[PDB]
């Protein structure tokens, strides 16, 4: 680890050069020493505020909602210092972290970060108030390049199907828990009583992890199968039968 | 207990439903039936059905189908629920799915 | 109850105060007995339909 710490009472110009030092070091490491680097940048919103300050110091008229008109290019010169390259055995993976002001998804900073990056993870507030850690909402979250990261020879041959089935079952269970409130719990099917045990078990056993608990990918997939074995083999519709034969009977 | 069944058929049907066990006299000596033959007119039919409805103790009014064939106006105007009204078949004309006031609301679902 | 609506249905409390007990003990036996059995069951079935 190489840690670059910039504090809220530090000079506001150093906040402009902090991610560029981080990414210069990352590029050295990855493309000259051939390591696999992961770069985590916390609260790009503070970076945007410092950008606004040093812009207004140049006597430039503000832009849309406060931030300069060239904020897209400035964020892009940071997010695009990443990727694999030809002839070198190293990479750079980036994980920006933002706080959405007013929980708005169309504020300039989240909106422009969506045009440069591939996917998003959502840290939810209903899941945080219900005392779940980590409070990650998987329905709005997405990874645009998951199809490339998973599979045979990379994690395991059952990864995509387990993930698809967990997503489907979770959405269906949420809908079932919606209907339960108006129809009543004594007028539910037996297949709608399974989508309500999956919900509790999924949020308390799969999502909720523990701040010092390290689960490899295979432990994650085994937990997924322990959760998918609630339903009879005939209800798991999104898993091909050639895999329901190898991993279901355990 | 709080409500009694009630008939409007003919002599044979009211006796069949007395054999079943229904048929009652008011404390005013009014019956839970009004037998109809070649004698009485339809105004009697309709005000009898009216005093059947407005009577606040009757729950299930049975009416032979061939009786209701010309007083469809009296029973189609009935739109509440608890004064239940069933039309009954017999040998003269058996049950016809057309002239029903409770299959009235099943338009399309057939 | 159905989804919050209260559908009204009927309970058939069976009372017993049979007045038709004479019914010609020696003039009409099993015949009328099975006849009233039939028509009482019919009464209950039409209660269900109501």
From Swiss-Prot, chain A:
Signal peptide residues on this chain, from the entry's feature table: none
Record localization: Apical cell membrane; Melanosome; Cytoplasm; Cytoplasmic vesicle, Secretory vesicle, Synaptic vesicle membrane
Tissue note: Kidney; localizes to early distal nephron, encompassing thick ascending limbs and distal convoluted tubules (at protein level).
Residues binding ATP: 144
Superkingdom of the source species: Eukaryota
Disease tied to this entry: Zimmermann-Laband syndrome 2: A form of Zimmermann-Laband syndrome, a rare developmental disorder characterized by facial dysmorphism with bulbous nose and thick floppy ears, gingival enlargement, hypoplasia or aplasia of terminal phalanges and nails, hypertrichosis, joint hyperextensibility, and hepatosplenomegaly. Some patients manifest intellectual disability with or without epilepsy. ZLS2 inheritance is autosomal dominant.
The protein's role, per its UniProt record: Non-catalytic subunit of the V1 complex of vacuolar(H+)-ATPase (V-ATPase), a multisubunit enzyme composed of a peripheral complex (V1) that hydrolyzes ATP and a membrane integral complex (V0) that translocates protons. V-ATPase is responsible for acidifying and maintaining the pH of intracellular compartments and in some cell types, is targeted to the plasma membrane, where it is responsible for acidifying the extracellular environment.
Protein family: Belongs to the ATPase alpha/beta chains family.
Record protein name field: V-type proton ATPase subunit B, brain isoform
Organism: Homo sapiens
Lineage per the UniProt record: Eukaryota, Metazoa, Chordata, Craniata, Vertebrata
Residues of the full protein shown: 257 to 506 of 511
Curated annotation (Swiss-Prot), chain B:
Positions of disulphide bridges: none
Function description: Subunit of the V1 complex of vacuolar(H+)-ATPase (V-ATPase), a multisubunit enzyme composed of a peripheral complex (V1) that hydrolyzes ATP and a membrane integral complex (V0) that translocates protons. V-ATPase is responsible for acidifying and maintaining the pH of intracellular compartments and in some cell types, is targeted to the plasma membrane, where it is responsible for acidifying the extracellular environment.
Assembly and interaction partners: V-ATPase is a heteromultimeric enzyme made up of two complexes: the ATP-hydrolytic V1 complex and the proton translocation V0 complex. The V1 complex consists of three catalytic AB heterodimers that form a heterohexamer, three peripheral stalks each consisting of EG heterodimers, one central rotor including subunits D and F, and the regulatory subunits C and H. The proton translocation complex V0 consists of the proton transport subunit a, a ring of proteolipid subunits c9c'', rotary subunit d, subunits e and f, and the accessory subunits ATP6AP1/Ac45 and ATP6AP2/PRR.
The species this protein was found in: Homo sapiens (Human)
Keyword check for Repressor: no
GO process terms (BP): endosomal lumen acidification; Golgi lumen acidification; intracellular pH reduction; lysosomal lumen acidification; proton transmembrane transport; synaptic vesicle lumen acidification; vacuolar acidification
GO cellular component term of the entry, any: endosome membrane
Protein localization: Cytoplasmic vesicle, Secretory vesicle, Synaptic vesicle membrane; Cytoplasmic vesicle, Clathrin-coated vesicle membrane
Protein name per Swiss-Prot or TrEMBL: V-type proton ATPase subunit F
Topological relation to the membrane, as annotated: Peripheral membrane protein
Keyword field: Cytoplasmic vesicle, Hydrogen ion transport, Ion transport, Membrane, Synapse, Transport
PANTHER family: V-TYPE PROTON ATPASE SUBUNIT F (PTHR13861:SF2), VACUOLAR ATP SYNTHASE SUBUNIT F (PTHR13861)
Family according to the record: Belongs to the V-ATPase F subunit family.
Highest rank taxon of the organism: Eukaryota
Swiss-Prot record, chain C:
Protein family (similarity comment): Belongs to the V-ATPase D subunit family.
Oligomeric form and interacting partners: V-ATPase is a heteromultimeric enzyme made up of two complexes: the ATP-hydrolytic V1 complex and the proton translocation V0 complex. The V1 complex consists of three catalytic AB heterodimers that form a heterohexamer, three peripheral stalks each consisting of EG heterodimers, one central rotor including subunits D and F, and the regulatory subunits C and H. The proton translocation complex V0 consists of the proton transport subunit a, a ring of proteolipid subunits c9c'', rotary subunit d, subunits e and f, and the accessory subunits ATP6AP1/Ac45 and ATP6AP2/PRR. Interacts with SNX10.
Phylogenetic lineage: Eukaryota, Metazoa, Chordata, Craniata, Vertebrata
Function as written in the Swiss-Prot or TrEMBL entry: Subunit of the V1 complex of vacuolar(H+)-ATPase (V-ATPase), a multisubunit enzyme composed of a peripheral complex (V1) that hydrolyzes ATP and a membrane integral complex (V0) that translocates protons. V-ATPase is responsible for acidifying and maintaining the pH of intracellular compartments and in some cell types, is targeted to the plasma membrane, where it is responsible for acidifying the extracellular environment. May play a role in cilium biogenesis through regulation of the transport and the localization of proteins to the cilium.
Protein name per Swiss-Prot or TrEMBL: V-type proton ATPase subunit D
Organism of this sequence: Homo sapiens (Human)
Protein localization: Membrane; Cytoplasmic vesicle, Clathrin-coated vesicle membrane; Cytoplasm, Cytoskeleton, Microtubule organizing center, Centrosome; Cell projection, Cilium
